[PDB]
Write an enzyme that holds these catalytic residues in place. Sequence first.
Site, short mmCIF file in Angstrom:
data_model
loop_
_atom_site.label_atom_id
_atom_site.label_comp_id
_atom_site.label_asym_id
_atom_site.label_seq_id
_atom_site.Cartn_x
_atom_site.Cartn_y
_atom_site.Cartn_z
N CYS A 107 -22.35 26.54 51.73
CA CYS A 107 -22.76 25.60 52.77
C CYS A 107 -24.26 25.62 53.05
CB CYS A 107 -21.99 25.87 54.07
SG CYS A 107 -22.31 24.61 55.34
N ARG A 110 -25.59 25.67 57.18
CA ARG A 110 -25.36 26.80 58.06
C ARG A 110 -26.39 27.09 59.15
NH1 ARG A 110 -23.87 31.44 53.92
NH2 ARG A 110 -25.28 30.19 52.62
N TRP A 279 -21.32 16.89 59.65
CA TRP A 279 -21.91 15.59 59.33
C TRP A 279 -22.37 15.63 57.88
CZ3 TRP A 279 -24.19 18.25 63.63
CH2 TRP A 279 -25.38 18.94 63.36
N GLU A 284 -24.07 13.56 49.22
CA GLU A 284 -22.65 13.77 49.04
C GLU A 284 -21.98 12.42 48.77
OE1 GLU A 284 -20.75 16.73 51.59
OE2 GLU A 284 -22.45 16.52 52.98
C1 HEM Z 1 -23.61 20.26 60.18
C2 HEM Z 1 -23.11 19.61 59.10
C3 HEM Z 1 -22.93 20.25 57.88
C4 HEM Z 1 -23.55 19.92 56.71
C5 HEM Z 1 -24.73 18.95 56.49
C6 HEM Z 1 -22.91 20.73 55.69
C7 HEM Z 1 -23.12 20.50 54.32
C8 HEM Z 1 -22.33 21.02 53.34
C9 HEM Z 1 -22.34 20.54 51.99
C10 HEM Z 1 -23.23 19.44 51.44
C11 HEM Z 1 -21.45 21.28 51.29
C12 HEM Z 1 -21.06 21.08 49.82
C13 HEM Z 1 -20.03 19.97 49.93
C14 HEM Z 1 -19.58 19.41 48.60
O1 HEM Z 1 -20.37 19.42 47.63
O2 HEM Z 1 -18.44 18.94 48.52
C15 HEM Z 1 -20.86 22.19 52.25
C16 HEM Z 1 -19.85 23.11 51.93
C17 HEM Z 1 -19.21 23.91 52.87
N1 HEM Z 1 -19.43 23.89 54.24
FE1 HEM Z 1 -20.86 22.92 55.26
N2 HEM Z 1 -21.93 21.58 56.22
C18 HEM Z 1 -21.94 21.30 57.58
C19 HEM Z 1 -21.05 21.86 58.51
C20 HEM Z 1 -20.03 22.75 58.20
C21 HEM Z 1 -19.07 23.27 59.14
C22 HEM Z 1 -18.95 22.85 60.61
C23 HEM Z 1 -18.33 24.21 58.48
C24 HEM Z 1 -17.34 25.12 58.96
C25 HEM Z 1 -17.00 25.35 60.26
C26 HEM Z 1 -18.77 24.16 57.11
C27 HEM Z 1 -18.16 24.88 56.07
C28 HEM Z 1 -18.46 24.73 54.73
C29 HEM Z 1 -17.68 25.33 53.67
C30 HEM Z 1 -16.60 26.39 53.85
C31 HEM Z 1 -18.14 24.82 52.52
C32 HEM Z 1 -17.66 25.07 51.09
C33 HEM Z 1 -16.35 24.33 50.87
C34 HEM Z 1 -16.01 24.17 49.40
O3 HEM Z 1 -16.15 25.16 48.67
O4 HEM Z 1 -15.60 23.06 48.99
N3 HEM Z 1 -19.82 23.28 56.92
N4 HEM Z 1 -21.38 22.02 53.53
C1 LIG Z 2 -16.44 19.31 57.06
C2 LIG Z 2 -17.79 20.04 57.28
C3 LIG Z 2 -18.95 19.16 56.75
N1 LIG Z 2 -19.21 19.49 55.32
C4 LIG Z 2 -19.82 18.59 54.57
N2 LIG Z 2 -20.89 17.99 55.03
N3 LIG Z 2 -19.43 18.25 53.35
C5 LIG Z 2 -18.25 18.80 52.62
C6 LIG Z 2 -17.18 17.71 52.44
C7 LIG Z 2 -17.76 16.31 52.16
C8 LIG Z 2 -17.57 15.80 50.70
N4 LIG Z 2 -18.62 16.37 49.86
C9 LIG Z 2 -17.61 14.28 50.66
O1 LIG Z 2 -18.53 13.67 50.12
O2 LIG Z 2 -16.68 13.69 51.22
#
Ligand code: HEM
Ligand SMILES: CCCNC(=[NH2+])NCCC[C@H](N)C(=O)O
Lengths: 409, 407
Positions: A107, A110, A279, A284
Amino acid sequence: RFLKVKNWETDVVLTDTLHLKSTLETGCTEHICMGSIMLPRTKDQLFPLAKEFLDQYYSSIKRFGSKAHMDRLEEVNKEIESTSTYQLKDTELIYGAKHAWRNASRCVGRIQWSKLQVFDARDCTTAHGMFNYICNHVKYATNKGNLRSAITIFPQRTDGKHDFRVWNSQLIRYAGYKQPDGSTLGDPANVQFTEICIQQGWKAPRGRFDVLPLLLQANGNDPELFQIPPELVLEVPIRHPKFDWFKDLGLKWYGLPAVSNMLLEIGGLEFSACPFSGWYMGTEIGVRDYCDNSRYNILEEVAKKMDLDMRKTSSLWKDQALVEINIAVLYSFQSDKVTIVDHHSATESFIKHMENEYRCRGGCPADWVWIVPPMSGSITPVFHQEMLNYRLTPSFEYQPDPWNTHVWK
Amino acid sequence: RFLKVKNWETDVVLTDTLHLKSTLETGCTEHICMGSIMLPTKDQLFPLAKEFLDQYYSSIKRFGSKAHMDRLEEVNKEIESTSTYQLKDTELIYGAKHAWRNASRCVGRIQWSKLQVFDARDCTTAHGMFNYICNHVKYATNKGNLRSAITIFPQRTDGKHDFRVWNSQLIRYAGYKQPDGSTLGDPANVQFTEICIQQGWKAPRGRFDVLPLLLQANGNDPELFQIPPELVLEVPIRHPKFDWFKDLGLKWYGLPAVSNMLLEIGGLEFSACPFSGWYMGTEIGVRDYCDNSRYNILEEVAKKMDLDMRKTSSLWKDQALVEINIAVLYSFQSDKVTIVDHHSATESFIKHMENEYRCRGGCPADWVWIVPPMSGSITPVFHQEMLNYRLTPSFEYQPDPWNTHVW
Ligand code: HEM
Ligand SMILES: CCCNC(=[NH2+])NCCC[C@H](N)C(=O)O
Ligand code: HEM
Ligand SMILES: C[C@H](O)[C@H](O)[C@H]1CNc2nc(N)[nH]c(=O)c2N1
Ligand SMILES: C[C@H](O)[C@H](O)[C@H]1CNc2nc(N)[nH]c(=O)c2N1
Ligand SMILES: CCCNC(=[NH2+])NCCC[C@H](N)C(=O)O
Ligand SMILES: [Zn+2]
């Protein structure tokens, strides 16, 4: 043992000690790195996991060794021996959820970890109940476009036969339908799930952007369908700042990304239904969801309209069209006032967060393969940053899709 | 164990067994992955030599033959007597080609078997090294029709008579620290550019001054030499639409030729083994031109394009990046100098990977390095899971000579 990490663009070197507390395996061996591989209890093992967690929790609030700390450990031990499991206090749940996010090495967002709204849905007992909880989460998180991170936590696993599960991979996602001619209508990524929904009774409008219905499983029972109130689903029509023909591509996307298929592990406890949302980072949608060959795959259509030289790859038409699409996604969201962050801002923030974490925490597990954006990789600071990937708990883990393991009634 | 690799775009799955023959460590452990870290005796020699000779004879379909056995005995006796041994020309060629074949970070290995090897083990002086290098440069350049090659100088002996090319690449631009505090030319070569001066070179103080070779033979002190200008093919960079691009006054050399690595074959070490191929567009246009620590030209190009650099979300850096790379490729292709774009190169690698998996049982690959610095996910390698591990013969990194040389 200390481990150094260097940023080859700033020469800034950091030292990691946090990895000393990593307990789980990574998938790599001293002879082979599986860094690019996408995805490589019992009374006995529960208390140690409980104790580790509680020590971390009490340490964080500066009450380690306190009487309150010792009583809680004794209380939990008694509970485990007596019931084989144990319930977390509200504060421990919040702490747990936040740290699972804080420990998610893939993520890039974070920097926002401490700001997470935790909704305790552990008193939920049915699928209709889960639906109500989820609607409230979507409305709260959406906040009319000013997105707020949140997570809803349903009852933890017990005997593994009464699991709560959200069969959808995301609370909000578009349906995908395979046509007999071999083509696909909608989002290819969700064809199998869409098929299940239809089989369960969903009347698919069979369009290109149909918001899927929620398939919810409560207490190990067979899943049930529910339609999210349309008024609760915020979407954004995609248009370009200079290309007035872009809008006519008929593109749009939902504003709320909400992962709902992961497992939240806290102190040995397993929460199989724990939808969370934040968000979007523009790429993405702009790069992956729209341009992956196995997703909407709009590069050609966009390219043609731009009248690019598609005769030879060396013209970099794909790359040119890719930039315009991502400009369109960001422009549209900003214009509609729906939270979103571009990859330049998001990666720069992650570096600051990561450095902060090294100094205050002694480390920040990170998966380079996932942190680096799918476009313009080297012009973002993360590309030049060495990282160390290791697993800390609490954490979010993958779990097999429920249809592959569920015992129907 | 038998590991599997999947391509999440085509669902194709490949099984890897080749990794079970890995020898060196990866820097990773069950508790931590260091995938993104840039760089994580007679009794020792014969085992290595045996391992090598075994794979050699196996490759020629003579495994366990008398010739195989005789050779193994000859080398064995040679080591016990001379504390080292010499490779037959055939083993040398096989080794070099395979060190390339095993370079997990190289995306252009589909070309591995087509490598011209120049045996320079008879070399004894820096001037001789210069002569060998010029011949290599000329052969590889081939008037723009680049041909891969490697020149192998004498192997290490007592570590005190090592041959070394002090340059990181045979052809590279100098970098100087200016009064302003800024850097003139390529910042990546500032230190080397100084050691050349500190050694005698008369730097022209230009933005693109081809550095002089600093050759070290038999452990002696390095000597300077100027590559015949007529041998250094360069390409002026222009855009096929923005006629203002030429004004940037940018140019790059056509021959990429890494010279600071160490070639290890059957336990033997070749400290001076310059090799060359050709460029993938992004290397120059994305990394050398846009890296903040390099020519860092994004802002300039952005301005001339007149795009809103006020907010990052306009993606001006991205727009400017594409054009800069369209130009590099355009220029090279116009001047008929060999060059490959990241789309074509990654597609080839995927094919090479599939070939390697079905003929060798695997292909060590470093995803972090294989995926291009731009448009990552629109290239196939992005969606390709890869297994990284070390096989010999191999190309290894080695300390810069100026940090170990005893003048
Ligand atoms: C504030 C907004 C956030 C942004 C911009 C963000 C962005 C991202 C992105 C771009 C990825 C890779 C997604 C992908 O390629 O499919 C990711 C993965 C992840 N994020 Fe965040 N995130 C955010 C909030 C959160 C929140 C609120 C949580 C948990 C409470 C979280 C948990 C994770 C986890 C566990 C992954 C890896 C999931 C996987 O392996 O598919 N994220 N995040
Ligand atoms: C749910 C926490 C936010 N994580 C996040 N920004 N992206 C992970 C899921 C979004 C996914 N890559 C999509 O294009 O649909
Ligand atoms: C024919 C054209 C070739 C292409 C297009 C190609 C391309 C590449 C690229 C893009 C990289 C990473 C470059 C960087 O980011 O610095 C690379 C690395 C590498 N290549 Fe190739 N290559 C070719 C020929 C060769 C040859 C002839 C050899 C050996 C004889 C070779 C050995 C290596 C090695 C050892 C590395 C890794 C070096 C390091 O760790 O920095 N390549 N190659
Ligand atoms: C095979 C490879 O691991 C896979 O394509 C990964 C690479 N990096 C990624 N990075 C992010 N953020 N999301 C992804 O889905 C992936 N996919
Ligand atoms: C820190 C990180 O390892 C570093 O920036 C790597 C990433 N991938 C790379 N890939 C290639 N081809 N070349 C490089 O120099 C790098 N640098
Ligand atoms: C020397 C064999 C060819 N290898 C190669 N294409 N690239 C590696 C060195 C070139 C370096 N990345 C540059 O931009 O200058
Ligand atoms: Zn690893």
